Short mmCIF file of C-alpha atoms and ligand atoms in Angstrom, two decimals:
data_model
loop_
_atom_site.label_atom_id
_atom_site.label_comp_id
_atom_site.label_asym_id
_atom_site.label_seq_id
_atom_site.Cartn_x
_atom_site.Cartn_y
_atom_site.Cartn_z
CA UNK F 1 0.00 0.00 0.00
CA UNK F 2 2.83 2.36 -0.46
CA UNK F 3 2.18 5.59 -1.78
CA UNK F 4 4.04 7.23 -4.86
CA UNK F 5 5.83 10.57 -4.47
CA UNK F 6 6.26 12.76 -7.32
CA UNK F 7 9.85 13.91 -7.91
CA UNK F 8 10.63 17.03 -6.13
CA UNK F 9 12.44 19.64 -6.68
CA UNK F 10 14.15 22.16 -4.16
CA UNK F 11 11.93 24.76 -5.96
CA UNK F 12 8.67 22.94 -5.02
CA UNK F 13 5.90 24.17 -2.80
CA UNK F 14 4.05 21.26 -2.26
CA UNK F 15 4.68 17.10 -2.15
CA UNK F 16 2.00 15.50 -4.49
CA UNK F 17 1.25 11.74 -5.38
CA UNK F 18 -0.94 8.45 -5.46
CA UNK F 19 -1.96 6.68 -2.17
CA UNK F 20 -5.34 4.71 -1.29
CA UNK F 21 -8.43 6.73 -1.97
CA UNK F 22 -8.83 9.11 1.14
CA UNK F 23 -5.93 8.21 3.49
CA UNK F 24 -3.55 10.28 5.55
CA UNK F 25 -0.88 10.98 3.89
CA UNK F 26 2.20 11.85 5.97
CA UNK F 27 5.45 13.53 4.87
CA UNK F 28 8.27 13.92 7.43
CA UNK F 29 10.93 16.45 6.64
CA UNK F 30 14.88 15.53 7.97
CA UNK F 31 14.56 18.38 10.50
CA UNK F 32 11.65 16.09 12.29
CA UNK F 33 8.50 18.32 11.68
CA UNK F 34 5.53 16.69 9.59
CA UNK F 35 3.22 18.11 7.07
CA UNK F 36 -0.36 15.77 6.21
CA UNK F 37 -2.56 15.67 3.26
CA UNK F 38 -5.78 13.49 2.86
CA UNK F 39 -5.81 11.69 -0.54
CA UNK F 40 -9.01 12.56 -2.14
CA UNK F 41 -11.90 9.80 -4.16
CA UNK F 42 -9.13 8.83 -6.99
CA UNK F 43 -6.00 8.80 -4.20
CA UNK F 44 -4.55 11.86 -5.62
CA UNK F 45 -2.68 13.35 -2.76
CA UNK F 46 -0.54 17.11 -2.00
CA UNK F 47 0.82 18.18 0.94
CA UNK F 48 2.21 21.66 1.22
CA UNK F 49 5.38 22.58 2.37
CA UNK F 50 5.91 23.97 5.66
CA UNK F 51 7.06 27.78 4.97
CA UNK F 52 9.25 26.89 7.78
CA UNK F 53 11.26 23.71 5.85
CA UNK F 54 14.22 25.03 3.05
CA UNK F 55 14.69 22.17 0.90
CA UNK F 56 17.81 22.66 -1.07
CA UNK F 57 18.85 19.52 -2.70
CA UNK F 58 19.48 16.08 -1.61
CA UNK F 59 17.69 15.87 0.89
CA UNK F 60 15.36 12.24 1.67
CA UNK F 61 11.87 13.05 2.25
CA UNK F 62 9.38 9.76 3.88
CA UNK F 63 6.14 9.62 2.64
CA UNK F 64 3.49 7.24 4.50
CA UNK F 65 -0.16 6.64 4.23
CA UNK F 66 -2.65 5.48 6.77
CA UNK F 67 -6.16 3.96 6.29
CA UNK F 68 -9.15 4.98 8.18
CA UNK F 69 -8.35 1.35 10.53
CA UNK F 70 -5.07 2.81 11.27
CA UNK F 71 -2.96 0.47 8.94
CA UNK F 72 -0.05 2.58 7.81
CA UNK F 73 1.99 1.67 4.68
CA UNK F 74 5.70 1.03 4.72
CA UNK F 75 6.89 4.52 3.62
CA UNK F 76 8.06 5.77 0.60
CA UNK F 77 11.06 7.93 -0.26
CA UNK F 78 11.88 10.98 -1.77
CA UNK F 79 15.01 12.65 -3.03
CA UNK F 80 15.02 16.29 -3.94
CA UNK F 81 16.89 17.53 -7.10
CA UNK F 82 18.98 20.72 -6.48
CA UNK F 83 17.31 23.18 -9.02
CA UNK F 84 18.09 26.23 -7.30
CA UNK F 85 21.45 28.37 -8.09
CA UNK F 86 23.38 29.62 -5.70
CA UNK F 87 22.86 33.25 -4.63
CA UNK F 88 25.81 35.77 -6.45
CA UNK F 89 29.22 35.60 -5.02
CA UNK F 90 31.02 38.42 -3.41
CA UNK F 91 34.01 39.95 -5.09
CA UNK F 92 36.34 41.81 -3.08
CA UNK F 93 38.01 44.61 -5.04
CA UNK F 94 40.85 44.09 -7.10
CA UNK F 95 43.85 46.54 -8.31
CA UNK F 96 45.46 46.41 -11.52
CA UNK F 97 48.59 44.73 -9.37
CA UNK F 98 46.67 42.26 -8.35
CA UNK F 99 47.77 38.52 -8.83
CA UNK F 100 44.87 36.85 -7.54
CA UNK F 101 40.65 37.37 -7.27
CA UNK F 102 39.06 36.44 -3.97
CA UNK F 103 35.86 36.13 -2.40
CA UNK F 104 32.58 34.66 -0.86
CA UNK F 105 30.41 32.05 -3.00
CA UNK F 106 28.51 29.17 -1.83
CA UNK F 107 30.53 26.25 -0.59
CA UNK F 108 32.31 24.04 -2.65
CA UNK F 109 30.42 25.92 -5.84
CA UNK F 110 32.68 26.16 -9.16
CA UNK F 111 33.44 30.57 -9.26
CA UNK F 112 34.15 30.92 -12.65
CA UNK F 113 35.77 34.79 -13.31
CA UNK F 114 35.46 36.38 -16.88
CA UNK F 115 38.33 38.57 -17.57
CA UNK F 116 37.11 41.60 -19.58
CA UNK F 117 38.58 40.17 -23.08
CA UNK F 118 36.13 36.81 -22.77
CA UNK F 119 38.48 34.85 -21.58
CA UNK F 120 37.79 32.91 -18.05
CA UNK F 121 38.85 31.49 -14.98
CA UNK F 122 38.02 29.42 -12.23
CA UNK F 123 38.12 28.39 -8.56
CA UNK F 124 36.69 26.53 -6.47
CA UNK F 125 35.10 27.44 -2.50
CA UNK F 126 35.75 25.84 0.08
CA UNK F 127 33.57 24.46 3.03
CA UNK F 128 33.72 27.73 4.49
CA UNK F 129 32.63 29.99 0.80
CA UNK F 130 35.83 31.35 0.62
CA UNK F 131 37.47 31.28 -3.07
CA UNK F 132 40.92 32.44 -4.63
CA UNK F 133 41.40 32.61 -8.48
CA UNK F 134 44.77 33.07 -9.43
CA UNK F 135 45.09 35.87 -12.15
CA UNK F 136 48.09 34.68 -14.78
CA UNK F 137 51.15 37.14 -14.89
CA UNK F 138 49.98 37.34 -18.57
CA UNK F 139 46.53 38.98 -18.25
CA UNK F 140 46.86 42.40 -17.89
CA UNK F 141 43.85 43.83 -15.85
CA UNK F 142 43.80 47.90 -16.67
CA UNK F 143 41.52 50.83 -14.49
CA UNK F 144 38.09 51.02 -15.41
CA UNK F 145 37.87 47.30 -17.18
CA UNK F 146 34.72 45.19 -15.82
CA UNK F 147 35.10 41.88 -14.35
CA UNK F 148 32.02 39.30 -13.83
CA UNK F 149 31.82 36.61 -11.36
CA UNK F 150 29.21 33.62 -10.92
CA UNK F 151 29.27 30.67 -8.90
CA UNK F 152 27.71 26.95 -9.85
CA UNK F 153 26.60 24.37 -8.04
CA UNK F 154 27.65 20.81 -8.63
CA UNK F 155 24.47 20.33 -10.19
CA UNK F 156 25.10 22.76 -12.55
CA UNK F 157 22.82 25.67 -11.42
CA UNK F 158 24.53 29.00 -12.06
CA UNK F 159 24.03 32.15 -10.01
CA UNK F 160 23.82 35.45 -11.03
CA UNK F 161 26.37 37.23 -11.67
CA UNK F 162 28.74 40.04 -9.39
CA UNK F 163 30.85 42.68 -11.31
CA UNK F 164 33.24 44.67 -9.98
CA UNK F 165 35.79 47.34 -11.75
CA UNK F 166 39.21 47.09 -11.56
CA UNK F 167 41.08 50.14 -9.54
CA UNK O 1 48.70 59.20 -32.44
CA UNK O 2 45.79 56.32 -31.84
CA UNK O 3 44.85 55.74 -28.85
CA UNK O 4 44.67 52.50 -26.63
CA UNK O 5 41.52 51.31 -25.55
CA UNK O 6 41.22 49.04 -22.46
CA UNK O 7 38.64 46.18 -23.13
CA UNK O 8 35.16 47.03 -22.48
CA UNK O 9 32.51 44.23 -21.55
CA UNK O 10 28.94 44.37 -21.97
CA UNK O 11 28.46 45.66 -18.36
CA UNK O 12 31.06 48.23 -18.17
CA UNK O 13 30.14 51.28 -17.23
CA UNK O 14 33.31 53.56 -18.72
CA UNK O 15 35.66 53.04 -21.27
CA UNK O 16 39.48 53.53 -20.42
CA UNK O 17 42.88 53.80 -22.05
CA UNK O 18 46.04 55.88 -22.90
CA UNK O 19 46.03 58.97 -25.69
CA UNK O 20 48.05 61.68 -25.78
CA UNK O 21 48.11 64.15 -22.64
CA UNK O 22 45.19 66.87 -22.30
CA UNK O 23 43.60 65.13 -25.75
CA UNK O 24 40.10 65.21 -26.04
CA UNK O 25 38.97 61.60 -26.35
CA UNK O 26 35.99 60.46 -28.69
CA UNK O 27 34.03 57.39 -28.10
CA UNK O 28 31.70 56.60 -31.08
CA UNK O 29 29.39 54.10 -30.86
CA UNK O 30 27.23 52.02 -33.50
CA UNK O 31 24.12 53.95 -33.13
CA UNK O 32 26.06 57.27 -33.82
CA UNK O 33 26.41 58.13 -30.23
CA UNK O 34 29.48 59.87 -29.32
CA UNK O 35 30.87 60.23 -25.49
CA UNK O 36 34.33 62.61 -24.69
CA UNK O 37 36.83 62.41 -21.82
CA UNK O 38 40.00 64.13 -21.60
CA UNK O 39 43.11 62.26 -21.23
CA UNK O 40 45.26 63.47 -17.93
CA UNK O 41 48.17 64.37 -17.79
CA UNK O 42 49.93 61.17 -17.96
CA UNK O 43 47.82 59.87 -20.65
CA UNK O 44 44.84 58.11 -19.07
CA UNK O 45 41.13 58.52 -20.32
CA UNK O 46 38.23 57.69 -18.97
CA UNK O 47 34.85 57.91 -20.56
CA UNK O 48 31.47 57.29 -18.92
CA UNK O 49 29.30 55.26 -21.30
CA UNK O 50 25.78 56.95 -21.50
CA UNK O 51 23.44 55.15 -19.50
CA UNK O 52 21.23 55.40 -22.73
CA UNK O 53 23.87 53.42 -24.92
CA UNK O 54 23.24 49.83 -23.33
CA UNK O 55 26.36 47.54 -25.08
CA UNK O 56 25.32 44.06 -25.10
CA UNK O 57 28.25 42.63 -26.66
CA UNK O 58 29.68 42.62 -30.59
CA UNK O 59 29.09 46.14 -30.73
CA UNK O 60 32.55 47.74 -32.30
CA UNK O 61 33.79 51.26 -30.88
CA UNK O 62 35.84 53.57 -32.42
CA UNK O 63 38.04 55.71 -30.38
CA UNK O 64 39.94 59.31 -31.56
CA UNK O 65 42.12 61.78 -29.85
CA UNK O 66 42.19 65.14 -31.24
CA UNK O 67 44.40 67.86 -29.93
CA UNK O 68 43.78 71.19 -29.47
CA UNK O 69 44.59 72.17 -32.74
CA UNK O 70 42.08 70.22 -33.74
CA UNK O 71 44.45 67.61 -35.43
CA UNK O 72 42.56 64.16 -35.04
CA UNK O 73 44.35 60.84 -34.26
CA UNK O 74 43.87 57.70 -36.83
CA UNK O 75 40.82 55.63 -34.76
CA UNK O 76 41.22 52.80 -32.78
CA UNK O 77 38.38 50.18 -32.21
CA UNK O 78 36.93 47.40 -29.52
CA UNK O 79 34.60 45.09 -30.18
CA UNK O 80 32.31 44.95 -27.26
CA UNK O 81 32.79 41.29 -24.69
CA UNK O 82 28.90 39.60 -24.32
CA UNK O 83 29.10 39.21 -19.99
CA UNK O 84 25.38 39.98 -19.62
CA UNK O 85 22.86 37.06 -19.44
CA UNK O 86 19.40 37.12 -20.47
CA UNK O 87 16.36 38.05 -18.83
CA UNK O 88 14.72 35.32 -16.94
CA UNK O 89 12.12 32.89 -19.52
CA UNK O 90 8.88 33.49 -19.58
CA UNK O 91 6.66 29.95 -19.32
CA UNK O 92 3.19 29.39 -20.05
CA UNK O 93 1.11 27.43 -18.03
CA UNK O 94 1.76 23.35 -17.97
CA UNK O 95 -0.74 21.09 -17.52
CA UNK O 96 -0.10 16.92 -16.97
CA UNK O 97 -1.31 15.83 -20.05
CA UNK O 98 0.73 18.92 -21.70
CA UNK O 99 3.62 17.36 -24.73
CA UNK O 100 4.94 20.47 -24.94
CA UNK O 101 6.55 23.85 -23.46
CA UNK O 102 6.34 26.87 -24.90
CA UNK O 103 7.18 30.69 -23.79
CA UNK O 104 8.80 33.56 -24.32
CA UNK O 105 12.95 34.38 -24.47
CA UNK O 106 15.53 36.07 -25.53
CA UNK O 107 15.58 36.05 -29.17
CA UNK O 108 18.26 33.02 -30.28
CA UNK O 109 18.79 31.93 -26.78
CA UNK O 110 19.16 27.92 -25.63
CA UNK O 111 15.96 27.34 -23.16
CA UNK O 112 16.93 24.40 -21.18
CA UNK O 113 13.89 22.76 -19.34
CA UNK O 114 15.01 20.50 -15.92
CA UNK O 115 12.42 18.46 -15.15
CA UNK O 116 11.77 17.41 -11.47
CA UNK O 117 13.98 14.63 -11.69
CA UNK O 118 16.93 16.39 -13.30
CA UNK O 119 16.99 16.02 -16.83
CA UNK O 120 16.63 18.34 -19.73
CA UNK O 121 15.36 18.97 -22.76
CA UNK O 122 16.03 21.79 -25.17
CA UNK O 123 15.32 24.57 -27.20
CA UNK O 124 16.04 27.43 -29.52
CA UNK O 125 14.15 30.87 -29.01
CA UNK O 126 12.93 32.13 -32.53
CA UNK O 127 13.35 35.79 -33.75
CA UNK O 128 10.01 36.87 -31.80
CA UNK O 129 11.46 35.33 -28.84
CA UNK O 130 9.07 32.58 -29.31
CA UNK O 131 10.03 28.98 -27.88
CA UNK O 132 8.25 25.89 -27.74
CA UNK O 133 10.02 22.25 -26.70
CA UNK O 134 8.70 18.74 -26.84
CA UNK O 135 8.94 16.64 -23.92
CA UNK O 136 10.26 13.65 -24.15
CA UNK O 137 7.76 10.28 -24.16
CA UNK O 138 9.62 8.93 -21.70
CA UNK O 139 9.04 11.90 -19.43
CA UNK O 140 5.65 11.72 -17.08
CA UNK O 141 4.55 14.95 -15.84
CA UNK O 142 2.45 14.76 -12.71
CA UNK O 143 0.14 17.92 -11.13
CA UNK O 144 2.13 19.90 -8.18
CA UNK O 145 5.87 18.87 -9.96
CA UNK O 146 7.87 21.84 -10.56
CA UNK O 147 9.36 23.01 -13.71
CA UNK O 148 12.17 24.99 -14.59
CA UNK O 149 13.53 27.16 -17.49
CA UNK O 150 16.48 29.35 -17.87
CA UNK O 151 18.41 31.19 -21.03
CA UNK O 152 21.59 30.91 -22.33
CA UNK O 153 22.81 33.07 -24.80
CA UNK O 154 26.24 31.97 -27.55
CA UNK O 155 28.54 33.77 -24.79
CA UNK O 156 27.48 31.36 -22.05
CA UNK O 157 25.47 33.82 -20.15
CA UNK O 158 22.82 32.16 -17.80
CA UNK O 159 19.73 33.52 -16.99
CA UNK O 160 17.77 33.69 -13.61
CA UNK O 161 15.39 30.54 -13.13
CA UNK O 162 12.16 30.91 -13.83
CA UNK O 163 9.79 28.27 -12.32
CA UNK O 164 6.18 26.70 -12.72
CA UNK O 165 4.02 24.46 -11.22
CA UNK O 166 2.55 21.50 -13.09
CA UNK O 167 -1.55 21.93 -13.18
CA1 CA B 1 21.78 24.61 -5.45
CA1 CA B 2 23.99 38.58 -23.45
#
């Protein structure tokens, strides 16, 4: 008697699926807290997320259902797909001396830097956010030239981007 | 005589570079548009770019220097650097039974579509912006999953999400 659980994303607002005609369906969150939904005559079932639960990604929801005899199914599961970029790194500013880029971006996301010409590079954050892309002794960053930053998650959502103008 | 121009991205804000001292620089753009700066006295210009003049990449410049004899330098041009992504996708509405998604984009932009369980399909926005892409048969589509769509234009350049719920 297992319900079905429709994929969810980390954009979703609500859990929806199958389960016996007018059970309760039951959807525990990892943080502990619950959210219910009552299938209706054809077992179509949603549940609405908790404003209170941020799903980001990865995370293993449990679906159950329980008859009006109190005969609950084994539970289903639930994994959600990271949809959601990560908000736009910080750039801290950067002199026409510089040798290296550095910032804030979500941990562990791919920063990608393009130089004002097009061309690009790249660093990665660590657990804590903080990234370092090393500028090559061979780009020459000038006054007044833009520079554009975004970060990616390893799913392959990309933020907006940050500019900043080099001093 | 020509002056240098520094390389100027689609969301620069000023163009800079070296021309003779105390010249009066002259930034023409495609549109006819014309911006001045005067180079100090070591050389360096910068120009504001006219908030009206928006640069979205490909554009060429030309830069002159004229003294105050009114001798003009030989031009130099810059082809404008594409860093600026599109506007979020606009996505009409999506039922279960739908075999197709269709909205509005930037004009020769990639729409990618992630369904809830993380795979894509694909398509090209037409010269009205129009796009419309077939889902895949293998693909079920279920009321309260969440869809997303974002832009991409040839530089790379990712839009903002833009999301909708399955009806
Ligand atoms: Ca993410
Ligand atoms: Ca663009």
């Amino acid at each position: 008697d297992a319900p079905t659980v429709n994929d969810v994303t980390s954009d979703a607002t609500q859990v929806t699926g199958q389960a016996e005609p007018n059970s309760t369906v039951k959807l525990t969150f990892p943080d502990g807290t619950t959210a219910t939904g009552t299938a209706d005559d054809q077992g179509n079932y949603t549940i609405d997320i908790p404003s209170n639960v941020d799903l980001n990604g990865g995370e293993e929801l449990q679906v159950t259902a329980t008859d009006k005899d109190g005969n609950t199914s084994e539970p289903s599961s639930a994994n959600v797909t990271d949809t959601t970029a990560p908000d736009a790194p910080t750039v801290n500013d950067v002199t026409s001396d510089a040798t290296q880029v550095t910032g804030q971006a979500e941990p562990n996301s791919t920063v990608k830097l393009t130089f004002p010409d097009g061309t690009t590079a790249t660093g990665t954050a660590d657990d804590q956010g903080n990234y370092t892309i090393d500028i090559p002794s061979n780009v020459d960053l000038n006054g007044g030239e833009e520079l554009q930053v975004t970060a990616t998650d390893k799913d392959g959502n990309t933020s907006e981007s940050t500019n900043t103008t080099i001093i």
